[PDB]
A paper describes a structure:
Despite the low sequence identity, the overall structure of human AAR2Δloop in the AAR2Δloop–PRPF8RH complex is very similar to that of yeast Aar2pΔloop in complex with the Prp8p RH and JM domains (Weber et al., 2013; Galej et al., 2013; root-mean-square deviation of 2.13 Å for 236 pairs from 330 AAR2 and 342 Aar2p Cα atoms). As previously observed for Aar2p, human AAR2Δloop exhibits an N-terminal domain (NTD; residues 10–158) mainly composed of β-strands, an α-helical C-terminal domain (CTD; residues 202–364) and a C-terminal, irregularly structured tail (residues 365–384). As in yeast, the NTD lacks direct interactions with PRPF8RH, while the CTD and the C-terminal tail of AAR2 establish two interfaces with PRPF8RH (interfaces I and II, respectively). Compared with yeast Aar2p, the AAR2 CTD harbors two extended helices (α11 and α12). In addition, Ile225 and Met230 are shifted by four residues (about one helical turn) along the α5 helix compared with the equivalent residues in yeast Aar2p, giving rise to a markedly different angle with which human AAR2Δloop contacts the PRPF8 RH domain compared with yeast Aar2pΔloop in the Aar2pΔloop–Prp8pRH–Prp8pJM complex.
The U5-specific PRPF8 protein is one of the most conserved nuclear proteins and coordinates proteins, snRNAs and the pre-mRNA at the catalytic center of the spliceosome. PRPF8 harbors two regulatory pseudo-enzyme domains at its very C-terminus, comprising an RNase H-like (RH) and a Jab1/MPN-like (JM) fold. In a previous study, we demonstrated that the human Aar2p homolog AAR2 is produced from the c20orf4 gene in HeLa cells and that it stably binds the PRPF8 RH domain in vitro. U5 snRNP assembly in yeast requires binding of the the Aar2 protein to Prp8p as a placeholder to preclude premature assembly of the SNRNP200 helicase, but the role of the human AAR2 homolog has not yet been investigated in detail.
Author numbering:
A (entry chain B): 1758 to 2014
B (entry chain A): 10 to 158, 202 to 312, 322 to 378
């Protein structure tokens, strides 16, 4: 029995002809700290989102998960996985046939079974996990996204494109690498990395864009810094801090081993 | 004491079994030769009889194990014969003329009969006390013999692959994929229309056929069936005594496993459902105790939610 998965050997398929979605369920069940009327600290759920992302076009489907779906429900943790799969399935159904995904890659293995069950009517879709640990969960540290989710009053599907206008000047592989670098940096530390994304006080991101408007050399500058921020976190975490192991060993770091 | 089993026990005699054959009942085994002609002092009830031929004439310490279930009676006498043609035991009924001569001879045959070791009875009962004649009659193969390696197929109840009713909406697909109670009831009503707890005998039957018959496909059925039961949360409210018995069945079954994952997950779900405030208090107190037992034994936290089920904790003002 074959058990496919995104790996370092095949990850070129992301940019190949076919249509591929990443699905991250990580941020659909979220809570915050909360004080009861009686003055005791507990948690309460806040809104979440499903991240559905096409790595070849940059296309993002951000399904906002409003807390009403939890109301009067038990074991939200388990239920979140099944809610995600319902929405991916509902999304696939609304798309015309030539737009449905050929492969769904999940960030978390708990999503394989619920997806398989809800996608039983789409027998040709590959549903598999990933050996690369891609930091898609940091998408809500992007304040445009975090705030739209936090304040949503109703379930909604909002479409974005994570590659802004890069695809006019760079390939999907380079575009993807740039996005994962930013996301991993935002995962390493939000604050240091948002600084690095504003090299200049006049550097502004467009209204319809996600990422700051930068020159070709500024982007080079920002990507060097984000690399150093990620690697300084690896060294400090794993206490094997060398510039010595980097012969495309960095490729393993940035993508997630 | 239990000396009364000399007079009141059952006796199984096997005729013309080749020297070196492996023969046994329940957890007990004997090597076969001219000085061994079966088993005496067997406690009445249902028992599992097994045997393996020699490998390839000269013993290589192997032979595919075969087995069959017998309902044995007080002062009963069973006469089994070896088939030279088939290299297996012939369960064909012995002529009652042949049986009566055999019983007239038990006094002299007693030197050649191994006493059933009473010290193993208590463990065998713990694994089979829910197996009835109805169970054996329903599950055993067409030709009644279970085999490690075609008329030998155990006749297990069909288990559903689809957990939800036909035409279910996405929300109903979700509800019935998380709570298998609808699925479990579809099996109960078809297999055991009037006595749902008969499922418990089928679960012991499967476990025995694996543990003592080395039939792997009965371990898989045991797994499927146990999964159907442990993830059927609503059902615990409905079939409450069924689940009280399942805990005791399971304590003895798992006591015979070394725990070489499928069980840790299904049992976590079971304990979540069985230990909630929702269920009958005696089920909850029993599930509580079994949980602590299982934790200490297997060094696992069956009372923990799975790690991948935690929410993101978001810092916000």
């Amino acid at each position: 029995p074959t058990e496919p998965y995104l790996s370092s050997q095949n990850y070129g398929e992301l940019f190949s002809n076919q249509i591929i979605w990443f699905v991250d369920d990580t941020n659909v069940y979220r809570v915050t700290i909360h004080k009861t009327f009686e003055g005791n600290l507990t948690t309460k759920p806040i809104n979440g989102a499903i991240f559905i992302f096409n790595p070849r076009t940059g296309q993002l489907f951000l399904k906002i998960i409003h807390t009403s779906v939890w109301a009067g429900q038990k074991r939200l943790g388990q239920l979140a996985k099944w809610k995600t799969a319902e929405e991916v399935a509902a999304l696939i159904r609304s798309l015309p046939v030539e737009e449905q995904p050929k492969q769904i890659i999940v960030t978390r293995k708990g999503m394989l079974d619920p997806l398989e069950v809800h996608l039983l009517d789409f027998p040709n879709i590959v549903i598999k996990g990933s050996e690369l640990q891609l930091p898609f969960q940091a998408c809500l540290k992007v304040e445009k996204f975090g705030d739209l989710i936090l304040k949503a009053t109703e379930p909604q599907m909002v479409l974005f494109n994570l590659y802004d206008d890069w695809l006019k000047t760079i390939s999907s592989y380079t575009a993807f690498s740039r996005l994962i670098l930013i996301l991993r940096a935002l995962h390493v530390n939000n604050d240091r990395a948002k600084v690095i994304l504003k090299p200049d006080k006049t550097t502004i991101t467009e209204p319809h864009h996600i990422w700051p408007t930068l020159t070709d050399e500024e982007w080079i500058k920002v990507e060097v810094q984000l690399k150093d921020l990620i690697l300084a976190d690896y060294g400090k975490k794993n206490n094997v801090n060398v510039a010595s192991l980097t012969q495309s060993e960095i490729r393993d770091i940035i993508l997630g081993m | 004491l239990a000396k009364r089993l000399f007079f009141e026990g059952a006796t199984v005699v096997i005729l013309n079994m080749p020297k070196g054959t492996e023969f046994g009942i329940d957890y007990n085994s004997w090597e076969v030769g001219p000085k061994f002609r079966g088993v005496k002092m067997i406690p009445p009830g249902i028992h599992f009889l097994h045997y393996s031929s020699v490998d390839k004439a000269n013993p290589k310490e192997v032979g595919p194990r075969m087995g069959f279930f017998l309902s044995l009676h007080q002062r009963g006498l069973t006469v089994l014969r070896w088939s030279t043609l088939r290299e297996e035991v012939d369960l064909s009924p012995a002529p009652e003329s042949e049986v009566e001569a055999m019983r007239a001879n038990l006094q002299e045959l007693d030197q050649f009969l191994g006493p059933y070791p009473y010290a193993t009875l208590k463990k065998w009962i713990s694994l089979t006390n829910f197996i009835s004649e109805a169970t054996v009659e329903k599950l055993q193969p067409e030709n009644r013999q279970i085999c490690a390696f075609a008329g030998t197929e155990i006749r297990f109840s069909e288990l559903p692959t689809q957990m939800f009713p036909e035409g279910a909406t996405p929300a109903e697909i979700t509800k019935h994929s998380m709570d298998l109670s609808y699925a479990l009831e579809t099996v109960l009503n078809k297999q055991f229309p009037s006595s749902p707890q008969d499922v418990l005998g089928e679960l012991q039957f499967a476990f025995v056929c694996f543990l003592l018959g080395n039939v792997y496909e009965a371990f898989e059925h045991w797994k499927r069936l146990l999964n159907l039961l442990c993830r059927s949360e609503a059902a615990m409210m409905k079939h409450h005594t069924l689940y009280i018995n399942l805990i005791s069945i399971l304590y003895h079954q798992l006591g015979e496993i070394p725990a070489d994952n499928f069980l840790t997950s299904t049992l976590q779900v079971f304990f979540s459902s069985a230990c909630s405030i929702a269920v009958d208090a005696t089920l909850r107190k029993k599930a509580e105790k079994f949980q602590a037992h299982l934790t200490k034994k297997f060094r696992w936290d069956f009372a923990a939610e799975p790690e991948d089920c935690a929410p993101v904790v978001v810092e916000l003002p």
